[PDB]
DNA sequence: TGCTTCCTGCCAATAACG
DNA sequence: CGTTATTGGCAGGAAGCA
């Protein structure tokens, strides 16, 4: 169908044929191939663009209302993606937020409706 | 070479099923 | 509506880009 299988070391991979990129997750691989069959189509509600994930058309949506969602808990400046928040905290207080402390609150998303992640 | 978007393991939230 | 399947949000490194 839209896969075959690799097993190396009694560990199972998922291989893509068109691109032959690997996955440990099946569903990985489905959430992948999207972009080659563009069987199904994320449209922004905000323009024309037109994404092959949701997550990725999400992303995109929350440019258009700039809700800043990511804040530095070291100086209050909030940010709209992860790269940003990490970017200044590396570089204005010289720590890393994908180490051992929390640097970075992440809010919910209020200005679109999506999901909710309760421990936020 | 510093923004900008992509990528995929993981799994909570949601949907589908029966 | 309780059990099973699916969706897609998240991190944070990778890749794209000018
Ligand atoms: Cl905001
Ligand atoms: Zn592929
Ligand atoms: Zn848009
Ligand atoms: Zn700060």
């Not at 569903?27 to 189509?41: C, M, V, Y």
Request: with cysteine.
């Amino acid at each position: 169908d839209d896969h075959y299988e690799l097993i190396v070391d009694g560990r199972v991979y998922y291989i893509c044929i068109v691109c032959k990129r690997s996955y440990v997750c099946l569903t990985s691989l489905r959430r992948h191939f999207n972009i080659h069959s563009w069987e199904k189509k994320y449209p922004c509600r905000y323009c024309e663009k037109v994404f092959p994930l949701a997550a990725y058309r999400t992303k995109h949506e929350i440019h258009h209302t700039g809700e800043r969602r990511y804040q530095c808990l070291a100086c209050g400046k909030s940010f709209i993606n992860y790269q940003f928040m990490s970017s200044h905290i590396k570089s204005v207080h010289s720590q890393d937020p994908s180490g051992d402390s929390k640097l970075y609150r992440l809010h919910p998303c209020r200005s679109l409706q999506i999901r909710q992640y309760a421990y936020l």
